[PDB]
Amino acid sequence: EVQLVESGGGLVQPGGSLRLSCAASGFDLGGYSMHWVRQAPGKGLEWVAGIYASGGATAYADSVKGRFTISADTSKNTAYLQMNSLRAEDTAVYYCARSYYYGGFGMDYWGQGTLVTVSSASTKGPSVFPLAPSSKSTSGGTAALGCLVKDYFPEPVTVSWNSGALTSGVHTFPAVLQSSGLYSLSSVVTVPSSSLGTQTYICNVNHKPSNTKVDKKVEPKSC
Amino acid sequence: EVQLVESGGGLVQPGGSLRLSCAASGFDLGGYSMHWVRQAPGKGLEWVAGIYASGGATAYADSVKGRFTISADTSKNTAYLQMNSLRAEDTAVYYCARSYYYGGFGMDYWGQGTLVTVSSASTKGPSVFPLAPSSKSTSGGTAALGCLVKDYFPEPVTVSWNSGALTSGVHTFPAVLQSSGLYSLSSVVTVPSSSLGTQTYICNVNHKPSNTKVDKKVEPKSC
Amino acid sequence: ATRFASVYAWNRKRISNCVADYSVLYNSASFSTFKCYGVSPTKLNDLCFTNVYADSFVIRGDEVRQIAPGQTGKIADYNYKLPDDFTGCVIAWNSNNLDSKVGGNYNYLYRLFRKSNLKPFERDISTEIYQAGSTPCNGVEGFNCYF
Amino acid sequence: PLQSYGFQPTNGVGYQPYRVVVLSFELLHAPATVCGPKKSTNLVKNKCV
Amino acid sequence: DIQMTQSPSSLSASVGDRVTITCRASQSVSSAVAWYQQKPGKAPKLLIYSASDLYSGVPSRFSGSRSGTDFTLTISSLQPEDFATYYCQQSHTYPITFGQGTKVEIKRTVAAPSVFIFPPSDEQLKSGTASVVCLLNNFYPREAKVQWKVDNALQSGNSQESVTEQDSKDSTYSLSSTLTLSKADYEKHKVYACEVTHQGLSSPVTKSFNRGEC
Amino acid sequence: DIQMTQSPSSLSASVGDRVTITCRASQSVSSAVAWYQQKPGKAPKLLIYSASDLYSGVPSRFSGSRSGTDFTLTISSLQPEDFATYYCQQSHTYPITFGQGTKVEIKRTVAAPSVFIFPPSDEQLKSGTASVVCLLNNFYPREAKVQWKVDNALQSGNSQESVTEQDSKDSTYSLSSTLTLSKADYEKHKVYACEVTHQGLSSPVTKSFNRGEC
Amino acid sequence: DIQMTQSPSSLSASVGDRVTITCRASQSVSSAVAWYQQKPGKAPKLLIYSASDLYSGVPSRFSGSRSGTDFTLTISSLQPEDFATYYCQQSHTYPITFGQGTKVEIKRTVAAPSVFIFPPSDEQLKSGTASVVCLLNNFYPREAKVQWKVDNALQSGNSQESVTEQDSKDSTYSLSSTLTLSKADYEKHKVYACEVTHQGLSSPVTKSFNRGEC
Structure with missing residues (x-):
C-alpha cells in the first residue's frame, strides 16, 4: 500500500500564504509523480501541481501558476505545497495523491484532505437565537422549536439539544459561509407538541475549533 | 473605413453588474457575429461572448457562462453585453468586434475599447511616498529621485514630474491592480546629479477618474 | 464563359475529339494574367494530349498564381489542389464589370472550412452546414453550425 | 508510449500475466496448407467405398 | 488542459x-x-x-x-x-x-414536506436583524426550493440557504430557506410567505404569516 | 476549449x-x-x-x-x-x-543600468514599516533581475518587483525592486544590499547601506 | 371516476x-x-x-x-x-x-401591444387603495402577461387580471392587468413598472412611472 497523507491546514488572511505538507509511507517514492489536488467546499477535484519524485520535474495548473510551488523531499519521505497570494476563492480541502511517471495513469492513492481557508474574520464565537414554535401542530400532532447559529469561525460546529442530551427529533443543517466572513446554520426539534412545554430544549452549540460553546435555552412562545 | 465604437464603461461593486454597448460605423452588421473581447490589466486578450447578427444564436466563453448575456440589433446596427455577478478580477478593457458567420473568421471589425472596473474600494485618492536619492552617482554622472504611488482608484492615472513640466529623464511604471482593490505604480527622474539640488521634482499624479490630484515633493537628502 | 463557379464548387469540363488554340488566347490576351506550369504559353496546341481539361472558377488577383500545378497557398491547398505530376496554364480575366455588386455576389460561394483539405481536381458543391462545435447540426444554422 | 507491464506474483487474477496465442483460421482462394488431423479411418478392401 | x-x-x-x-x-x-x-x-x-x-x-x-x-x-x-x-x-x-x-x-417514495414557517422571535430581533425562517421537513426527491416573498414581492439577495443530509432508511431530508432583513426593514413589511416547490411536488405548499404573529 | x-x-x-x-x-x-x-x-x-x-x-x-x-x-x-x-x-x-x-x-546598444539605492527614509518609516528600494534605470536588453541580501544572506519572501515601459528611441527601461520589513524587523538587521544583473552585464553591481542609514 | x-x-x-x-x-x-x-x-x-x-x-x-x-x-x-x-x-x-x-x-396577424400604463389617479386613491393599471392594447398571439414591478422588484400575488375578446379581422385583443396596494403601501414605493412580454414579442416593452405622477 502506497500512502501520502496531508496536514498543515489553517487560515490565511487575504494576500497571505500557507505551507502544506504530507508524510509518505510504505514505498519507494522513485518512479511516482506526487500531486496536489484542491477541493473547494461544494466542488469537485481541481489538480494544482505535480512533481516527479525521481527527477524534480514539475507541472502546474493555470489557476496557480505564479502563485503556488510544489516540491518534495525524499530524505524526509514527505511532500510539500507552498501556496502564495491567497484569496477567499482558494478555500479548499487540499489533498496529496500519487500516480506514475509523467501521465497515462490515474491516481493510485489519496489522502483524506486538510482544510485551508481564507477569511476576513478568522476568530469568532457564536451568536445564538431561538425560533418560536408554530402556533398550530403539524401532521402527526408534532411541533418544533429551534435556533439559529450565526457569525462564528472556524467550522466545524456540532449542534444538538438539551445541552447535548437530546438527539431524538433533532434536525440540523450544515453550516454555510456568509458575506460576514463567518459561518451560520440552523436547527429544530420536532416532537408531539405538548412535549415542547415539558422537555428541555437548550441549543447546544459546540465549537472546539474556536475554543468555545453556547447553551441557548429555547422556549415556546404564547401564540 | 470601418470602425466600431464602445460605450457604457464604468465601475461595478463586487457582485454587481454593468451593461456595455457598441455601435457599428461604415458597414452593415448583418452576415457577421458580434463579439466581446476582454483585456485585464497585465493580461493579453481573452474572448468573452458573441451573437450572430443575422440569426440570434449565442454562445459564451467558459469563464463567463451563466453569468453574461448578449444581444444584437441590425436595425440599429448596434450590440450589447450584460455582465452580472462581477468580481475584481473582471476589471478589464472590453472591446467590441465583428466576424463572419458564427466563427472561422477573425475580427473584421474592431473597436477602441472601454474600461470596466470592479472593486471593493470604489472611490480613493492616492498616497504618494518619496524616494530619497543614492549617496553615490552612477555612470554618466547621474543621480535620481522618485516616488511610489499607492492605493488609488479607478485607473487611468497619469504620472509626470516637476508638477507636469518634466518629462525628460522620466521613467514611469504602468499601474497594476493590488489585493487592496486599489491601483499602484511608481516613477523616477534620472538626471546629472547636480540637477537634483537645483530643479524641482514634484511627483505629479493626475487622477481624472477619481476627480483628484496629488503634488508630492521629492528632494535630495543627505545619504 | 459568361459565368464561372466558385473555387470549391469547381466547374470541370473535358476536351477531346477537338482542337483548342492556347497560343491564340495567350497572344490575344483577353485575360489579364497568364501563367503556365510545365507547359508553354505559346506553341502549346502542337503538344499531343488525349484528355485536356479546362475548368472554371473565381478567385482574387492575389490568388491567380496559387491556383496552378505545383503551387501552394490558401486557395490551392484548401479549395482546389493541382499536384506536381500535372502540367497546365492558369488564365485569369478581371470580371469586376460583370460580377461585382455592392453588397457582394451571392451566386458564388467561397469555402472556408472543410474537415480536411479538398483533393486534387476534386469538385465539391456542398452547402451542408459546417460542424465546428460539439453540438450536432440540425439542418439549421446556430452557434458553431454555419453554411 | 508503452509502460512496462506490472506483472508480479502478488497480482490479482486480472493483473497476472498470461501467455496468449490467438488463432485465426483463414480461407483464401488457394489450396489449403494447414489441416488438423483428418481422423483417418481403416482401409477397406473388396468393398465399394 | x-x-x-x-x-x-x-x-x-x-x-x-x-x-x-x-x-x-x-x-x-x-x-x-x-x-x-x-x-x-x-x-x-x-x-x-x-x-x-x-x-x-x-x-x-x-x-x-x-x-x-x-x-x-x-x-x-x-x-x-x-x-x-x-x-x-x-x-x-x-x-x-x-x-x-x-x-x-x-429511490424512495416521493412526498410533500411538512412545512414550518417561523416568524422572527422576540429574542432574535434583539440581534438588530430579523431572520425569517421556513423549513421544509422530511421530504423527497433531493432537489427542492422555497421562493420567499415579502408583501408578495419576490424577495432575493437577502436570503440564505442550507440543505441537510438524507435519512438512511427513507432518503428524506430537510431544506432551510431564510431571509434576513434589518429589524428596521422587517418593521416596514406586513406579509411574509414561503412558497414551497420541488421536483416531486405537484401541489405547492404555501405558508404565511403577518408581521407580529408568533 | x-x-x-x-x-x-x-x-x-x-x-x-x-x-x-x-x-x-x-x-x-x-x-x-x-x-x-x-x-x-x-x-x-x-x-x-x-x-x-x-x-x-x-x-x-x-x-x-x-x-x-x-x-x-x-x-x-x-x-x-x-x-x-x-x-x-x-x-x-x-x-x-x-x-x-x-x-x-x-536591436539597440547593450548597456548597464544606473543603479540607485533609495534606503528607507525617515518619512517612510513613520508608517511603522520599512521599505528598501533599488531602482535600475535606463538599461537594455529587456531581460534583467534584482536580488537582495540582508546581513549578507540572500533574502526571499519579503520582496516585490515592478517593470516599466521601454523608451521609444533607445528601448531602454527600468526595474523597481523592493524589500518590505516591519520597522520592528528592520531594527533587528544590520546590513542591506542590492545585487544587480542583466543579460548584457559582465560586471554585476552591488550597492549597500547600514540599517538606519539615509 | x-x-x-x-x-x-x-x-x-x-x-x-x-x-x-x-x-x-x-x-x-x-x-x-x-x-x-x-x-x-x-x-x-x-x-x-x-x-x-x-x-x-x-x-x-x-x-x-x-x-x-x-x-x-x-x-x-x-x-x-x-x-x-x-x-x-x-x-x-x-x-x-x-x-x-x-x-x-x-389565426391572423401577430403584433406587439400598444402599452398604456395608468398610474393610480387622484380620484381612485380616494377609495383608500391604489390600483396601478396597465393595458396591453391590440396584440396577438393570445398568450401574454405583465411582469409587474414595485421598486423594480418583480412582484407576484398582488396582481389582478381580465382579458377581452379577439378582433374578427386581426385576432388581436387587449389584456387588462393591475396591482393593488393600499394607498398607504403605494406611498411607500418610488418606482412602478409594467414589463410586457408575450409569445410573439422578442423585445419586452416596459413602461414606468414614479410614485405620485399622473
Whole structure:
C-alpha cells in the first residue's frame, strides 16, 4: 500500500500564504509523480501541481501558476505545497495523491484532505437565537422549536439539544459561509407538541475549533 | 473605413453588474457575429461572448457562462453585453468586434475599447511616498529621485514630474491592480546629479477618474 | 464563359475529339494574367494530349498564381489542389464589370472550412452546414453550425 | 508510449500475466496448407467405398 | 488542459438496483479516465485506474465501457457501501482534471414536506436583524426550493440557504430557506410567505404569516 | 476549449529587418488564425483575420503562412510604427483564445543600468514599516533581475518587483525592486544590499547601506 | 371516476382551415366520449355522442378517430359558426366527467401591444387603495402577461387580471392587468413598472412611472 497523507491546514488572511505538507509511507517514492489536488467546499477535484519524485520535474495548473510551488523531499519521505497570494476563492480541502511517471495513469492513492481557508474574520464565537414554535401542530400532532447559529469561525460546529442530551427529533443543517466572513446554520426539534412545554430544549452549540460553546435555552412562545 | 465604437464603461461593486454597448460605423452588421473581447490589466486578450447578427444564436466563453448575456440589433446596427455577478478580477478593457458567420473568421471589425472596473474600494485618492536619492552617482554622472504611488482608484492615472513640466529623464511604471482593490505604480527622474539640488521634482499624479490630484515633493537628502 | 463557379464548387469540363488554340488566347490576351506550369504559353496546341481539361472558377488577383500545378497557398491547398505530376496554364480575366455588386455576389460561394483539405481536381458543391462545435447540426444554422 | 507491464506474483487474477496465442483460421482462394488431423479411418478392401 | 463533464448530478437507485454515471472529455484522453468514490469527510477511494482497468479491491459490481469519446460506469447491484459521490479523472494531459461529482439516492417514495414557517422571535430581533425562517421537513426527491416573498414581492439577495443530509432508511431530508432583513426593514413589511416547490411536488405548499404573529 | 501557445516571448529586429513569430493552437482550428498589434494605451489593431487572409487596411509588410499545424507569422520589413506587442488568435471555435503576446526590440546598444539605492527614509518609516528600494534605470536588453541580501544572506519572501515601459528611441527601461520589513524587523538587521544583473552585464553591481542609514 | 385531459388550451385556425383538438381519458371509457361546441352565452351544442357517433344537425365538417386511448376531434373546414370552446365528455363510469375546454382563434396577424400604463389617479386613491393599471392594447398571439414591478422588484400575488375578446379581422385583443396596494403601501414605493412580454414579442416593452405622477 502506497500512502501520502496531508496536514498543515489553517487560515490565511487575504494576500497571505500557507505551507502544506504530507508524510509518505510504505514505498519507494522513485518512479511516482506526487500531486496536489484542491477541493473547494461544494466542488469537485481541481489538480494544482505535480512533481516527479525521481527527477524534480514539475507541472502546474493555470489557476496557480505564479502563485503556488510544489516540491518534495525524499530524505524526509514527505511532500510539500507552498501556496502564495491567497484569496477567499482558494478555500479548499487540499489533498496529496500519487500516480506514475509523467501521465497515462490515474491516481493510485489519496489522502483524506486538510482544510485551508481564507477569511476576513478568522476568530469568532457564536451568536445564538431561538425560533418560536408554530402556533398550530403539524401532521402527526408534532411541533418544533429551534435556533439559529450565526457569525462564528472556524467550522466545524456540532449542534444538538438539551445541552447535548437530546438527539431524538433533532434536525440540523450544515453550516454555510456568509458575506460576514463567518459561518451560520440552523436547527429544530420536532416532537408531539405538548412535549415542547415539558422537555428541555437548550441549543447546544459546540465549537472546539474556536475554543468555545453556547447553551441557548429555547422556549415556546404564547401564540 | 470601418470602425466600431464602445460605450457604457464604468465601475461595478463586487457582485454587481454593468451593461456595455457598441455601435457599428461604415458597414452593415448583418452576415457577421458580434463579439466581446476582454483585456485585464497585465493580461493579453481573452474572448468573452458573441451573437450572430443575422440569426440570434449565442454562445459564451467558459469563464463567463451563466453569468453574461448578449444581444444584437441590425436595425440599429448596434450590440450589447450584460455582465452580472462581477468580481475584481473582471476589471478589464472590453472591446467590441465583428466576424463572419458564427466563427472561422477573425475580427473584421474592431473597436477602441472601454474600461470596466470592479472593486471593493470604489472611490480613493492616492498616497504618494518619496524616494530619497543614492549617496553615490552612477555612470554618466547621474543621480535620481522618485516616488511610489499607492492605493488609488479607478485607473487611468497619469504620472509626470516637476508638477507636469518634466518629462525628460522620466521613467514611469504602468499601474497594476493590488489585493487592496486599489491601483499602484511608481516613477523616477534620472538626471546629472547636480540637477537634483537645483530643479524641482514634484511627483505629479493626475487622477481624472477619481476627480483628484496629488503634488508630492521629492528632494535630495543627505545619504 | 459568361459565368464561372466558385473555387470549391469547381466547374470541370473535358476536351477531346477537338482542337483548342492556347497560343491564340495567350497572344490575344483577353485575360489579364497568364501563367503556365510545365507547359508553354505559346506553341502549346502542337503538344499531343488525349484528355485536356479546362475548368472554371473565381478567385482574387492575389490568388491567380496559387491556383496552378505545383503551387501552394490558401486557395490551392484548401479549395482546389493541382499536384506536381500535372502540367497546365492558369488564365485569369478581371470580371469586376460583370460580377461585382455592392453588397457582394451571392451566386458564388467561397469555402472556408472543410474537415480536411479538398483533393486534387476534386469538385465539391456542398452547402451542408459546417460542424465546428460539439453540438450536432440540425439542418439549421446556430452557434458553431454555419453554411 | 508503452509502460512496462506490472506483472508480479502478488497480482490479482486480472493483473497476472498470461501467455496468449490467438488463432485465426483463414480461407483464401488457394489450396489449403494447414489441416488438423483428418481422423483417418481403416482401409477397406473388396468393398465399394 | 482537458475538461470533463459528468451526468446525472444525482441518480436514484435502491439497494440491489443499477447505477449509471457517465463522464465525457472535451478532447480525447484516449481511455485514461480514472474513477473515485468519496464519502463525506473521507479520501476519494480509487475505483478505476483507467476506463478498461478496475482497481484491485474494488468489487465486481463496478464495471464500465468506453463509447466513442464518452465512458459509462455502472454499479450492477448497488450496496449500502456504495453510496457516495462519484468522480471521474483524466490523466492523459496535464493538468489532471476531474468531474463535478455524482450523488446516489435510494429511490424512495416521493412526498410533500411538512412545512414550518417561523416568524422572527422576540429574542432574535434583539440581534438588530430579523431572520425569517421556513423549513421544509422530511421530504423527497433531493432537489427542492422555497421562493420567499415579502408583501408578495419576490424577495432575493437577502436570503440564505442550507440543505441537510438524507435519512438512511427513507432518503428524506430537510431544506432551510431564510431571509434576513434589518429589524428596521422587517418593521416596514406586513406579509411574509414561503412558497414551497420541488421536483416531486405537484401541489405547492404555501405558508404565511403577518408581521407580529408568533 | 482550444488553447494557443506562442514562441519566442520576444524578438530582436531593427528597422528593415524581419520579425518571425511562431503560434499554434493545441487542437486544429484550420485556417482561422488572426494577428493583432498593440501599443500601450491602445486597443490591439487587427492585422490578419484568418491565417489565410490579411485584413483590409493593413500594410503588405504583414503576412504569414501555414505548415503542418503551425502558423508562421511575420513582418517582412519592420518599421518604427511596428514596435508593438503582438497577439496570435484562433477563431474557429468558442472560447476564442489568444497567445501570450510577443514583444519586439529594435536591436539597440547593450548597456548597464544606473543603479540607485533609495534606503528607507525617515518619512517612510513613520508608517511603522520599512521599505528598501533599488531602482535600475535606463538599461537594455529587456531581460534583467534584482536580488537582495540582508546581513549578507540572500533574502526571499519579503520582496516585490515592478517593470516599466521601454523608451521609444533607445528601448531602454527600468526595474523597481523592493524589500518590505516591519520597522520592528528592520531594527533587528544590520546590513542591506542590492545585487544587480542583466543579460548584457559582465560586471554585476552591488550597492549597500547600514540599517538606519539615509 | 375517470377524469380526462384536453389539449391544446387553444388552437389557431382560419375560416376554411383544419382544427384538431384531443382528449385523453385516464382510464378506458371504451369509445363513449362525446364532444360539445360552446359559444359565450349559450349551452354547449352536442356534436358527438361517442368517438365515431356524430349528431345529426352537426356540420359534416366534424369527424374524428382514436389512437390507443386518445380521441382526436377535427373540423375539416372551419366556419365562423364553429368558433367555440370545445369540450369532451365521458359517459362510461360515474361520475360523468368532462375535459377542460379548448378555444379556437382565427389565426391572423401577430403584433406587439400598444402599452398604456395608468398610474393610480387622484380620484381612485380616494377609495383608500391604489390600483396601478396597465393595458396591453391590440396584440396577438393570445398568450401574454405583465411582469409587474414595485421598486423594480418583480412582484407576484398582488396582481389582478381580465382579458377581452379577439378582433374578427386581426385576432388581436387587449389584456387588462393591475396591482393593488393600499394607498398607504403605494406611498411607500418610488418606482412602478409594467414589463410586457408575450409569445410573439422578442423585445419586452416596459413602461414606468414614479410614485405620485399622473
